[PDB]
Amino acid sequence: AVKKFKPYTPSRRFMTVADFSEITKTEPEKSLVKPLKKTGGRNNQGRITVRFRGGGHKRLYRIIDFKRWDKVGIPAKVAAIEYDPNRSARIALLHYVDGEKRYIIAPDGLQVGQQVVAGPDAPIQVGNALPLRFIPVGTVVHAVELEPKKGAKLARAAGTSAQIQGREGDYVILRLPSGELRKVHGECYATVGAVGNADHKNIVLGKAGRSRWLGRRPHVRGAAMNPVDHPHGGGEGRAPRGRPPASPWGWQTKGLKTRKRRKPSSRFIIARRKK
Amino acid sequence: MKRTWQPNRRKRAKTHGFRARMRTPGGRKVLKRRRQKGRWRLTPAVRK
RNA sequence: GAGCUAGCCCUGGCCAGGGUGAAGCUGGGGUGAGACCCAGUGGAGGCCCGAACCGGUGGGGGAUGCAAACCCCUCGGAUGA
RNA sequence: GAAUGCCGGCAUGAGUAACGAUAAAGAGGGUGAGAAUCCCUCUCGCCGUAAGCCCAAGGGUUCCUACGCAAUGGUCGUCAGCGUAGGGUUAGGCGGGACCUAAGGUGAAGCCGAAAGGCGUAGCCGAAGGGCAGCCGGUUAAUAUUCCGGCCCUUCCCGCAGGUGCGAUGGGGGGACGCUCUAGGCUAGGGGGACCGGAGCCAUGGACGAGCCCGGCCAGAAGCGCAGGGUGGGAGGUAGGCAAAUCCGCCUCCCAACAAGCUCUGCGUGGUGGGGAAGCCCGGGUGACAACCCCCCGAAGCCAGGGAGCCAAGAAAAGCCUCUAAGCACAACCUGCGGGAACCCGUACCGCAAACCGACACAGGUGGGCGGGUGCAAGAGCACUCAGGCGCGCGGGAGAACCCUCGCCAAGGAACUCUGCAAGUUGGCCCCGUAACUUCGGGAGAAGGGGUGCUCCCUGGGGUGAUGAGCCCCGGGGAGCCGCAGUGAACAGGCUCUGGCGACUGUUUACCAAAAACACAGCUCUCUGCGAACUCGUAAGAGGAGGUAUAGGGAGCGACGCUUGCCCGGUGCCGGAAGGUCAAGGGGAGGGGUGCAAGCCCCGAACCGAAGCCCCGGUGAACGGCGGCCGUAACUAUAACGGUCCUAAGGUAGCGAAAUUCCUUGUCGGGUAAGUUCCGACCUGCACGAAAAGCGUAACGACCGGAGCGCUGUCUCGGCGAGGGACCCGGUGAAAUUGAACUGGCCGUGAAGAUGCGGCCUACCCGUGGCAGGACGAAAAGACCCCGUGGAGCUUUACUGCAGCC
RNA sequence: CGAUGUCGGCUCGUCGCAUCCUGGGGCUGAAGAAGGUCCCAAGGGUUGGGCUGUUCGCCCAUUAAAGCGGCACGCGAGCUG
RNA sequence: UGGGAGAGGGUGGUGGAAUUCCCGGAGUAGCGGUGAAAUGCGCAGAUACCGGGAGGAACGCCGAUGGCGAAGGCAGCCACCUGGUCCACCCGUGACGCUGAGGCGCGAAAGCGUGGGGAGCAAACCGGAUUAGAUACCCGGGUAGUCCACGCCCUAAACG
RNA sequence: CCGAGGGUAGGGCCCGUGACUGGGGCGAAGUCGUAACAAGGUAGCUGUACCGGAAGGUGCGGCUGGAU
Ligand SMILES: [Mg+2]
Ligand SMILES: [Mg+2]
Ligand SMILES: [Mg+2]
Ligand SMILES: [Mg+2]
Ligand SMILES: [Mg+2]
Ligand SMILES: [Mg+2]
Ligand SMILES: [Mg+2]
Ligand SMILES: [Mg+2]
Ligand SMILES: [Mg+2]
Ligand SMILES: [Mg+2]
Ligand SMILES: [Mg+2]
Ligand SMILES: [Mg+2]
Ligand SMILES: [Mg+2]
Ligand SMILES: [Mg+2]
Ligand SMILES: [Mg+2]
Ligand SMILES: [Mg+2]
Ligand SMILES: [Mg+2]
Ligand SMILES: [Mg+2]
Ligand SMILES: [Mg+2]
Ligand SMILES: [Mg+2]
Ligand SMILES: [Mg+2]
Ligand SMILES: [Mg+2]
Ligand SMILES: [Mg+2]
Ligand SMILES: [Mg+2]
Ligand SMILES: [Mg+2]
Ligand SMILES: [Mg+2]
Ligand SMILES: [Mg+2]
Ligand SMILES: [Mg+2]
Ligand SMILES: [Mg+2]
Ligand SMILES: [Mg+2]
Ligand SMILES: [Mg+2]
Ligand SMILES: [Mg+2]
Ligand SMILES: [Mg+2]
Ligand SMILES: [Mg+2]
Ligand SMILES: [Mg+2]
Ligand SMILES: [Mg+2]
Ligand SMILES: [Mg+2]
Ligand SMILES: [Mg+2]
Ligand SMILES: [Mg+2]
Ligand SMILES: [Mg+2]
Ligand SMILES: [Mg+2]
Ligand SMILES: [Mg+2]
Ligand SMILES: [Mg+2]
Ligand SMILES: [Mg+2]
Ligand SMILES: [Mg+2]
Ligand SMILES: [Mg+2]
Ligand SMILES: [Mg+2]
Ligand SMILES: [Mg+2]
Ligand SMILES: [Mg+2]
Ligand SMILES: [Mg+2]
Ligand SMILES: [Mg+2]
Ligand SMILES: [Mg+2]
Ligand SMILES: [Mg+2]
Ligand SMILES: [Mg+2]
Ligand SMILES: [Mg+2]
Ligand SMILES: [Mg+2]
Ligand SMILES: [Mg+2]
Ligand SMILES: [Mg+2]
Ligand SMILES: [Mg+2]
Ligand SMILES: [Mg+2]
Ligand SMILES: [Mg+2]
Ligand SMILES: [Mg+2]
Ligand SMILES: [Mg+2]
Ligand SMILES: [Mg+2]
Ligand SMILES: [Mg+2]
Ligand SMILES: [Mg+2]
Ligand SMILES: [Mg+2]
Ligand SMILES: [Mg+2]
Ligand SMILES: [Mg+2]
Ligand SMILES: [Mg+2]
Ligand SMILES: [Mg+2]
Ligand SMILES: [Mg+2]
Ligand SMILES: [Mg+2]
Ligand SMILES: [Mg+2]
Ligand SMILES: [Mg+2]
Ligand SMILES: [Mg+2]
Ligand SMILES: [Mg+2]
Ligand SMILES: [Mg+2]
Ligand SMILES: [Mg+2]
Ligand SMILES: [Mg+2]
Ligand SMILES: [Mg+2]
Ligand SMILES: [Mg+2]
Ligand SMILES: [Mg+2]
Ligand SMILES: [Mg+2]
Ligand SMILES: [Mg+2]
Ligand SMILES: [Mg+2]
Ligand SMILES: [Mg+2]
Ligand SMILES: [Mg+2]
Ligand SMILES: [Mg+2]
Ligand SMILES: [Mg+2]
Ligand SMILES: [Mg+2]
Ligand SMILES: [Mg+2]
Ligand SMILES: [Mg+2]
Ligand SMILES: [Mg+2]
Ligand SMILES: [Mg+2]
Ligand SMILES: [Mg+2]
Ligand SMILES: [Mg+2]
Ligand SMILES: [Mg+2]
Ligand SMILES: [Mg+2]
Ligand SMILES: [Mg+2]
Ligand SMILES: [Mg+2]
Ligand SMILES: [Mg+2]
Ligand SMILES: [Mg+2]
Ligand SMILES: [Mg+2]
Ligand SMILES: [Mg+2]
Ligand SMILES: [Mg+2]
Ligand SMILES: [Mg+2]
Ligand SMILES: [Mg+2]
Ligand SMILES: [Mg+2]
Ligand SMILES: [Mg+2]
Ligand SMILES: [Mg+2]
Ligand SMILES: [Mg+2]
Ligand SMILES: [Mg+2]
Ligand SMILES: [Mg+2]
Ligand SMILES: [Mg+2]
Ligand SMILES: [Mg+2]
Ligand SMILES: [Mg+2]
Ligand SMILES: [Mg+2]
Ligand SMILES: [Mg+2]
Ligand SMILES: [Mg+2]
Ligand SMILES: [Mg+2]
Ligand SMILES: [Mg+2]
Ligand SMILES: [Mg+2]
Ligand SMILES: [Mg+2]
Ligand SMILES: [Mg+2]
Ligand SMILES: [Mg+2]
Ligand SMILES: [Mg+2]
Ligand SMILES: [Mg+2]
Ligand SMILES: [Mg+2]
Ligand SMILES: [Mg+2]
Ligand SMILES: [Mg+2]
Ligand SMILES: [Mg+2]
Ligand SMILES: [Mg+2]
Ligand SMILES: [Mg+2]
Ligand SMILES: [Mg+2]
Ligand SMILES: [Mg+2]
Ligand SMILES: [Mg+2]
Ligand SMILES: [Mg+2]
Ligand SMILES: [Mg+2]
Ligand SMILES: [Mg+2]
Ligand SMILES: [Mg+2]
Ligand SMILES: [Mg+2]
Ligand SMILES: [Mg+2]
Ligand SMILES: [Mg+2]
Ligand SMILES: [Mg+2]
Ligand SMILES: [Mg+2]
Ligand SMILES: [Mg+2]
Ligand SMILES: [Mg+2]
Ligand SMILES: [Mg+2]
Ligand SMILES: [Mg+2]
Ligand SMILES: [Mg+2]
Ligand SMILES: [Mg+2]
Ligand SMILES: [Mg+2]
Ligand SMILES: [Mg+2]
Ligand SMILES: [Mg+2]
Ligand SMILES: [Mg+2]
Ligand SMILES: [Mg+2]
Ligand SMILES: [Mg+2]
Ligand SMILES: [Mg+2]
Ligand SMILES: [Mg+2]
Ligand SMILES: [Mg+2]
Ligand SMILES: [Mg+2]
Ligand SMILES: [Mg+2]
Ligand SMILES: [Mg+2]
Ligand SMILES: [Mg+2]
Ligand SMILES: [Mg+2]
Ligand SMILES: [Mg+2]
Ligand SMILES: [Mg+2]
Ligand SMILES: [Mg+2]
Ligand SMILES: [Mg+2]
Ligand SMILES: [Mg+2]
Ligand SMILES: [Mg+2]
Ligand SMILES: [Mg+2]
Ligand SMILES: [Mg+2]
Ligand SMILES: [Mg+2]
Ligand SMILES: [Mg+2]
Ligand SMILES: [Mg+2]
Ligand SMILES: [Mg+2]
Ligand SMILES: [Mg+2]
Ligand SMILES: [Mg+2]
Ligand SMILES: [Mg+2]
Ligand SMILES: [Mg+2]
Ligand SMILES: [Mg+2]
Ligand SMILES: [Mg+2]
Ligand SMILES: [Mg+2]
Ligand SMILES: [Mg+2]
Ligand SMILES: [Mg+2]
Ligand SMILES: [Mg+2]
Ligand SMILES: [Mg+2]
Ligand SMILES: [Mg+2]
Ligand SMILES: [Mg+2]
Ligand SMILES: [Mg+2]
Ligand SMILES: [Mg+2]
Ligand SMILES: [Mg+2]
Ligand SMILES: [Mg+2]
Ligand SMILES: [Mg+2]
Ligand SMILES: [Mg+2]
Ligand SMILES: [Mg+2]
Ligand SMILES: [Mg+2]
Ligand SMILES: [Mg+2]
Ligand SMILES: [Mg+2]
Ligand SMILES: [Mg+2]
Ligand SMILES: [Mg+2]
Ligand SMILES: [Mg+2]
Ligand SMILES: [Mg+2]
Ligand SMILES: [Mg+2]
Ligand SMILES: [Mg+2]
Ligand SMILES: [Mg+2]
Ligand SMILES: [Mg+2]
Ligand SMILES: [Mg+2]
Ligand SMILES: [Mg+2]
Ligand SMILES: [Mg+2]
Ligand SMILES: [Mg+2]
Ligand SMILES: [Mg+2]
Ligand SMILES: [Mg+2]
Ligand SMILES: [Mg+2]
Ligand SMILES: [Mg+2]
Ligand SMILES: [Mg+2]
Ligand SMILES: [Mg+2]
Ligand SMILES: [Mg+2]
Ligand SMILES: [Mg+2]
Ligand SMILES: [Mg+2]
Ligand SMILES: [Mg+2]
Ligand SMILES: [Mg+2]
Ligand SMILES: [Mg+2]
Ligand SMILES: [Mg+2]
Ligand SMILES: [Mg+2]
Ligand SMILES: [Mg+2]
Ligand SMILES: [Mg+2]
Ligand SMILES: [Mg+2]
Ligand SMILES: [Mg+2]
Ligand SMILES: [Mg+2]
Ligand SMILES: [Mg+2]
Ligand SMILES: [Mg+2]
Ligand SMILES: [Mg+2]
Ligand SMILES: [Mg+2]
Ligand SMILES: [Mg+2]
Ligand SMILES: [Mg+2]
Ligand SMILES: [Mg+2]
Ligand SMILES: [Mg+2]
Ligand SMILES: [Mg+2]
Ligand SMILES: [Mg+2]
Ligand SMILES: [Mg+2]
Ligand SMILES: [Mg+2]
Ligand SMILES: [Mg+2]
Ligand SMILES: [Mg+2]
Ligand SMILES: [Mg+2]
Ligand SMILES: [Mg+2]
Ligand SMILES: [Mg+2]
Ligand SMILES: [Mg+2]
Ligand SMILES: [Mg+2]
Ligand SMILES: [Mg+2]
Ligand SMILES: [Mg+2]
Ligand SMILES: [Mg+2]
Ligand SMILES: [Mg+2]
Ligand SMILES: [Mg+2]
Ligand SMILES: [Mg+2]
Ligand SMILES: [Mg+2]
Ligand SMILES: [Mg+2]
Ligand SMILES: [Mg+2]
Ligand SMILES: [Mg+2]
Ligand SMILES: [Mg+2]
Ligand SMILES: [Mg+2]
Ligand SMILES: [Mg+2]
Ligand SMILES: [Mg+2]
């Protein structure tokens, strides 16, 4: 559930906050944090290349194990579930019987005290990771690699998951979070279960200040600007779009498809997203 | 009110100083010109 | 040329005093268990009043100025974007 | 001789404005050629969360002393931040460097670019962050944590003694962290003392007093005491920490666990060294063998890496410790002690300002620390005042108009005016009390009202003590006294009813607009499967993101409530393996030039041949659009109904003379004596209408309307008073402007508005304070307007290109 | 057009007279009182308020009357805005 | 105490038929629909047939005039948790009872909020017919919704 | 001291009245269509939802107080 507030300020009337119930530990493992170099949306030339970024709360980056096949057969105990400011999902601290310690992102239903393990021979249980070819058709899965040994890329945000839909040759067929149907190589690793913190999307920010804490600076409409600034600029008084709705750079932004047509991964994408 | 000159010696030397000028094509031409004209000071003098 | 100004980045600093009294917690009541109600405790908030500090609402003065934007009175924010 | 020409010089305005905060001066003595202005003394005033003190920047000798006064100083000058000269800045411990890293910058390897150059993990550089050893007093004209004195301390080298598997740029621990709130115990700082020390005083009616006045501390190793921070111990196993590891991590077993222990810091004490007032006397002496004690208040500072709660989840690296590798184990390291060694730069002075930024000794701007006392509920607010610092570098008179800032006003009380603009009123605290409506928080300090000083008596609880006295905090009850008045001075909301717009706190046109504009949570459309889309770049490379569709980009709408209709013909976008059109290229029927020829060369039809366009369809919270005429009902009027032309389809709900209504001050109702505004209605909506959203909405607003109560010099209608100017005298002394001028009125004339022409009238010569009708007064080669085959910003289904993409 | 500042208000007037009032007259469909209409007459006078930026106008309460014009639609080196 | 029947309820899992869509094959001139038609779909290859896949909803036969529940209502199969009820024994308690204003709880469908899901169906809506007209009945489309969770709504020819 | 009451201010309840507006009843000599009663010409009624000049329609679920 999400936590609500009594309307004792105009903003607490709508503000909702996560309950943080799953979190058992409030400090990150010191050996697994490193400083995150805040960018402000600026590239190496010093230029804004993503608008309206910066000024958010300071964060340390928790190193996440998106490989997992690094330690096949070596089981680990779920020591803690922690807050991670760098992702919507929560993280889980693993204590391997190796003595090694790592973070994975927390599946839904994971239990502090539980054992997890990775490998072809892993049981089909929440928190375990296996190559896709050894996971039964129909089971929902997360932290999915897109190519072998390149790292988990798919189904990583809070509440997300992919479902195994069948097998074809060296490839399994997944329904991705987006509804897309895609072939992924069978040697790609995945973690059974869905990502936790599914309530994430029911959060109501509540005020402008909260967006600013996240590093989101105010977004100013193209219609509020001048012709030098934006296609939608100008007009005396307010103005409708007066042309097909465009980005600051002139390209149309109501329907225009933008995926590159000759892209090689088209050979592996069966059905474009839904909705 | 607060005016435009807010002197700062590190800023002066790091911006207009001799090593700054030497680092860059335009900066070296500045020096060449200033020497060709006979300037007594090639670069702003800063206490340091 | 970003020693003015705009934004961001790193690292420091500052915000008298007073007011309001959220959740939680404990007790009591309540019930099959609850919801919930009350009291105490508690100390939340782009909360309130108001200096510093940041402003620049209205009026008056100034107008070869004290000043190429100032002065007086009044007024906005003052734990927060 | 003219170019609002250029350079220079010198005039006019003119002895005029001004002399830079209205904090304020007076006298006496001295010095000197000269004194309102310099020095000295007494009196007066101003600052005191500063207008005092300390630090950082910036400035760069402005510091100290002597001798000067041409210029500088808004007057003066004997003085000075000015002229000349001499002197003055002392560090192992303060700051920076011989230490570390942050953003960033640079950059071996490596990548990219016509050149110049652009990137780039490591490394390096980079601080006001981390790290690191000095406190108190004294001394100079001028420096002092630097010199001196006392008491402490750090590192390097070397040697001795003891101890240990020693050893690192490698592994590990640690360093290492937010915001808000906050415990205990301390210190800084403060207040009181009938106690301790002290020169003296007894006035002018009283007091020789438990009188007045002054002061009553500072630093300090070891040790000890108090308060806190930090940390479990042993064994066994071990596959992880990119070699090794006995370290760290993980697993198990046993003692210990909110203890102690070990360790570290703070505070107290502490050998010792210091300081030491008023007053008086000429910075110094004396006071003085100074005393140096008790109680209370008490930090935001310290113990500290303390505690709790919360979500937005809060640097790095070295120093340090530990582990081991080569090695080396007569070494090496650790601990104690001792001797030696210990470099470079800064240090003066100003520092909220006359020494910095503003051309000025400029009412402006400038980061950190200290910032006493009393009273007002608190406080850094306000009044006064300590320490300390100042009276603002022109004065002296006068007592007009007028101006500024300020005080008061009979009767009236918004009649002022675009508007109560302005100014009154209200005003802190305690108590009583408080409406619609509401999202149940609020609205709310609603409104409105009562109390407020002093004296005496009684009494309740708390803090420190000890449980008591003392002190200090929070109270309660009774009886009285005084004044016009008790937050007696200063600081401190006027209130309400009702519309519009925007939900709200915020943001903005630096220097004419703060708003209804922007932003905002939230809603929807849409793109994006990750080497994402998108953005910057020629590229490499970056951002996006060390993120992964509960995510990221673009667009509109803008809390919330109830909702968001019809039109897909045009444009856009999406889908469509048919077909049409389609470039290079392929193909080569046929034709041509030339040659004696083989041959060389040229043109070229059918056919094959992509995107795009055409074509088929979908799509509105995509661009956008959302009718007209005639007829018809028991009176009239109107038309539920019917007919008909057109269209892609003819505006739904809701709202409506509106931030939209031309006619318009529509009509009607309300408010007013009177209402072009306002509120409520109606609907012939010139020309509302549903995310350029429609209609509502509690709360909010230095937004813009309308009304009322309170109160007022806003006004009837003006009067008086205050100070700073204006005026006069002494000192200093501008300005724009200026064809030259010996520069009146009228009625005329004149390029059509005459001091200057005609006629007439008026008029002795020259100034001072005043007022603004004229000199088509000054200022700025009109912004409007037009013209120029003048410019620039912007737009697009103008033209033609280019990037980008296909 | 190398600049002749603009509506309205406030303030300050001054003039014209085609006279709103007061004075003097003739005609009357002038009984009186009250009017109508023309003539002479510019000496003085010619109110306060609601609406609206307004001039104007409408309205309220009065009045002897609530005049119309000119003066760069008088007057911004006089004010307002 | 010992037994019984049952779509009584809640949670989780799971099975087959059918519709739709998508992919592959095969194949051609229509399919569909009605009282009859037209809109629509179809040579851009539909319908009819075969194979593969995805997905939601409802459970044929058994099934009945049946069963269960206080009512609303409950129907594939399995497991778990759980209510009511009947019978036989006549063992225990000793009138512990009946009803019940207020209260509390449950309460079909539609509807509402937040989020999922979306095959079929289907208000609104669009088109075709019918008809004097046809904002209907019939036909081709079609969005909420119908389904899941949680929170509301509290109505009925909630009837015997 | 209490005190009739008067005054300031703020609440509650009732009645009368109001531009305009909502539907209701009656009138009937009108206009429109014909929803219900027969299988009433789409069986009806129904709670609710959306919609249409109007009766009413349709969806979802329910009742028979439904003809054959
Ligand atoms: Mg949860
Ligand atoms: Mg809330
Ligand atoms: Mg709360
Ligand atoms: Mg709540
Ligand atoms: Mg509120
Ligand atoms: Mg609110
Ligand atoms: Mg929470
Ligand atoms: Mg959680
Ligand atoms: Mg680290
Ligand atoms: Mg990072
Ligand atoms: Mg860079
Ligand atoms: Mg750069
Ligand atoms: Mg650059
Ligand atoms: Mg940005
Ligand atoms: Mg997290
Ligand atoms: Mg969350
Ligand atoms: Mg949200
Ligand atoms: Mg954040
Ligand atoms: Mg946003
Ligand atoms: Mg915006
Ligand atoms: Mg604009
Ligand atoms: Mg630009
Ligand atoms: Mg452009
Ligand atoms: Mg443009
Ligand atoms: Mg536009
Ligand atoms: Mg426009
Ligand atoms: Mg515009
Ligand atoms: Mg605009
Ligand atoms: Mg417009
Ligand atoms: Mg606009
Ligand atoms: Mg706008
Ligand atoms: Mg538009
Ligand atoms: Mg437009
Ligand atoms: Mg347009
Ligand atoms: Mg593009
Ligand atoms: Mg791939
Ligand atoms: Mg300058
Ligand atoms: Mg500065
Ligand atoms: Mg300077
Ligand atoms: Mg500097
Ligand atoms: Mg510096
Ligand atoms: Mg600098
Ligand atoms: Mg340099
Ligand atoms: Mg020079
Ligand atoms: Mg020289
Ligand atoms: Mg130079
Ligand atoms: Mg910082
Ligand atoms: Mg503050
Ligand atoms: Mg309380
Ligand atoms: Mg709690
Ligand atoms: Mg606040
Ligand atoms: Mg406040
Ligand atoms: Mg600022
Ligand atoms: Mg102002
Ligand atoms: Mg004012
Ligand atoms: Mg004033
Ligand atoms: Mg002025
Ligand atoms: Mg000022
Ligand atoms: Mg002021
Ligand atoms: Mg104020
Ligand atoms: Mg305030
Ligand atoms: Mg405050
Ligand atoms: Mg606050
Ligand atoms: Mg704030
Ligand atoms: Mg902040
Ligand atoms: Mg000439
Ligand atoms: Mg000239
Ligand atoms: Mg000139
Ligand atoms: Mg000249
Ligand atoms: Mg010249
Ligand atoms: Mg002359
Ligand atoms: Mg004179
Ligand atoms: Mg003069
Ligand atoms: Mg003198
Ligand atoms: Mg003199
Ligand atoms: Mg003196
Ligand atoms: Mg004073
Ligand atoms: Mg003080
Ligand atoms: Mg200087
Ligand atoms: Mg000195
Ligand atoms: Mg001189
Ligand atoms: Mg002189
Ligand atoms: Mg002289
Ligand atoms: Mg001078
Ligand atoms: Mg001067
Ligand atoms: Mg002399
Ligand atoms: Mg001087
Ligand atoms: Mg000397
Ligand atoms: Mg020393
Ligand atoms: Mg050295
Ligand atoms: Mg360095
Ligand atoms: Mg440093
Ligand atoms: Mg140091
Ligand atoms: Mg010391
Ligand atoms: Mg010295
Ligand atoms: Mg950290
Ligand atoms: Mg730090
Ligand atoms: Mg904060
Ligand atoms: Mg001390
Ligand atoms: Mg005190
Ligand atoms: Mg005596
Ligand atoms: Mg202690
Ligand atoms: Mg090991
Ligand atoms: Mg002494
Ligand atoms: Mg002595
Ligand atoms: Mg003695
Ligand atoms: Mg504090
Ligand atoms: Mg969070
Ligand atoms: Mg942390
Ligand atoms: Mg680093
Ligand atoms: Mg060896
Ligand atoms: Mg050792
Ligand atoms: Mg050296
Ligand atoms: Mg030196
Ligand atoms: Mg010094
Ligand atoms: Mg000075
Ligand atoms: Mg200042
Ligand atoms: Mg001065
Ligand atoms: Mg100054
Ligand atoms: Mg002090
Ligand atoms: Mg006070
Ligand atoms: Mg006070
Ligand atoms: Mg104050
Ligand atoms: Mg004092
Ligand atoms: Mg003075
Ligand atoms: Mg002066
Ligand atoms: Mg005089
Ligand atoms: Mg003053
Ligand atoms: Mg008066
Ligand atoms: Mg009044
Ligand atoms: Mg009155
Ligand atoms: Mg007003
Ligand atoms: Mg006051
Ligand atoms: Mg009320
Ligand atoms: Mg309430
Ligand atoms: Mg009050
Ligand atoms: Mg109110
Ligand atoms: Mg008294
Ligand atoms: Mg008084
Ligand atoms: Mg004052
Ligand atoms: Mg106030
Ligand atoms: Mg007022
Ligand atoms: Mg009100
Ligand atoms: Mg509005
Ligand atoms: Mg606003
Ligand atoms: Mg706004
Ligand atoms: Mg709103
Ligand atoms: Mg809003
Ligand atoms: Mg707002
Ligand atoms: Mg604020
Ligand atoms: Mg401007
Ligand atoms: Mg401005
Ligand atoms: Mg400007
Ligand atoms: Mg400007
Ligand atoms: Mg202004
Ligand atoms: Mg503005
Ligand atoms: Mg404002
Ligand atoms: Mg704006
Ligand atoms: Mg906005
Ligand atoms: Mg919304
Ligand atoms: Mg972008
Ligand atoms: Mg580009
Ligand atoms: Mg890159
Ligand atoms: Mg990044
Ligand atoms: Mg990246
Ligand atoms: Mg990155
Ligand atoms: Mg991402
Ligand atoms: Mg906006
Ligand atoms: Mg409402
Ligand atoms: Mg319609
Ligand atoms: Mg269309
Ligand atoms: Mg279209
Ligand atoms: Mg169509
Ligand atoms: Mg178009
Ligand atoms: Mg074909
Ligand atoms: Mg041929
Ligand atoms: Mg829509
Ligand atoms: Mg159109
Ligand atoms: Mg549109
Ligand atoms: Mg219309
Ligand atoms: Mg209307
Ligand atoms: Mg309106
Ligand atoms: Mg508007
Ligand atoms: Mg309109
Ligand atoms: Mg018009
Ligand atoms: Mg109108
Ligand atoms: Mg009009
Ligand atoms: Mg009217
Ligand atoms: Mg008005
Ligand atoms: Mg108005
Ligand atoms: Mg009308
Ligand atoms: Mg727009
Ligand atoms: Mg609009
Ligand atoms: Mg506001
Ligand atoms: Mg405002
Ligand atoms: Mg006056
Ligand atoms: Mg007076
Ligand atoms: Mg006076
Ligand atoms: Mg005076
Ligand atoms: Mg005076
Ligand atoms: Mg005289
Ligand atoms: Mg002459
Ligand atoms: Mg003339
Ligand atoms: Mg003339
Ligand atoms: Mg003349
Ligand atoms: Mg002449
Ligand atoms: Mg002449
Ligand atoms: Mg002549
Ligand atoms: Mg003449
Ligand atoms: Mg004359
Ligand atoms: Mg004049
Ligand atoms: Mg003139
Ligand atoms: Mg003249
Ligand atoms: Mg003039
Ligand atoms: Mg003139
Ligand atoms: Mg020119
Ligand atoms: Mg011109
Ligand atoms: Mg011009
Ligand atoms: Mg010009
Ligand atoms: Mg202009
Ligand atoms: Mg023109
Ligand atoms: Mg032309
Ligand atoms: Mg021409
Ligand atoms: Mg151009
Ligand atoms: Mg002109
Ligand atoms: Mg001129
Ligand atoms: Mg001119
Ligand atoms: Mg008669
Ligand atoms: Mg006559
Ligand atoms: Mg006559
Ligand atoms: Mg007259
Ligand atoms: Mg006259
Ligand atoms: Mg008027
Ligand atoms: Mg008018
Ligand atoms: Mg009228
Ligand atoms: Mg009369
Ligand atoms: Mg006139
Ligand atoms: Mg005219
Ligand atoms: Mg005119
Ligand atoms: Mg005029
Ligand atoms: Mg006039
Ligand atoms: Mg005028
Ligand atoms: Mg003016
Ligand atoms: Mg005017
Ligand atoms: Mg003038
Ligand atoms: Mg004038
Ligand atoms: Mg005005
Ligand atoms: Mg104006
Ligand atoms: Mg059956
Ligand atoms: Mg039955
Ligand atoms: Mg028995
Ligand atoms: Mg129900
Ligand atoms: Mg339902
Ligand atoms: Mg429903
Ligand atoms: Mg019809
Ligand atoms: Mg709907
Ligand atoms: Mg819905
Ligand atoms: Mg039944
Ligand atoms: Mg009475
Ligand atoms: Mg019928
Ligand atoms: Mg029928
Ligand atoms: Mg309707
Ligand atoms: Mg109709
Ligand atoms: Mg229908
Ligand atoms: Mg039933």
Residue numbers in the entry:
A (entry chain 1D): 2 to 276
B (entry chain 17): 1 to 48
Task: List sentences quoted exactly from the publication behind this structure.
Many of currently used antibiotics inhibit protein synthesis in pathogenic microorganisms by targeting their 70S ribosomes, which are complex macromolecular machines responsible for this process. The catalytic peptidyl transferase center (PTC) located at the heart of the large ribosomal subunit (50S in bacteria) polymerizes amino acids into polypeptides in the order specified by the nucleotide sequences of the translated mRNAs. Newly-made proteins emerge from the ribosome through the nascent peptide exit tunnel (NPET) that spans the body of the large ribosomal subunit beginning at the PTC and ending on the opposite side of the large ribosomal subunit facing the cytoplasm. Here, we discover that well-known ribosomal antibiotics, hygromycin A (HygA) and macrolides, which target peptidyl transferase center and peptide exit tunnel, respectively, can act cooperatively against susceptible and drug-resistant bacteria.
To this end, we co-crystallized wild-type (WT) 70S ribosomes from the Gram-negative bacterium Thermus thermophilus (Tth) with HygA and one of the three macrolides (ERY, azithromycin (AZI), or TEL) and determined their structures at 2.5–2.6 Å resolution. In this experiment, we used Tth 70S ribosomes complexed with E. coli protein Y (PY) as a tool to obtain structures of higher resolution. The obtained electron density maps revealed all three drug pairs bound to their previously known binding sites on the 70S ribosome. Consistent with the previous structure, HygA binds in the A-site cleft of the PTC on the large ribosomal subunit with its aromatic ring sandwiched between nucleotides A2451 and C2452 of the 23S rRNA, and is oriented such that the aminocyclitol group protrudes toward nucleotide C2573, while the fucofuranose ring extends into the ribosome exit tunnel. Most importantly, the presence of a neighboring macrolide (either ERY, AZI, or TEL) does not affect the binding position of HygA, in which it interferes with the full accommodation of the amino acid moiety of an incoming aminoacyl-tRNA (aa-tRNA) into the ribosomal A site, resulting in inhibition of peptide bond formation. In all three structures of macrolides in combination with HygA, the desosamine moiety of a macrolide forms two hydrogen bonds (H-bonds), which were suggested to be crucial for macrolide binding: one between the hydroxyl group of the desosamine and the N1 atom of the nucleotide A2058, and the second one between the dimethylamino group of desosamine sugar and the N6 atom of A2058 via a water molecule that is also coordinated by the phosphate of G2505.
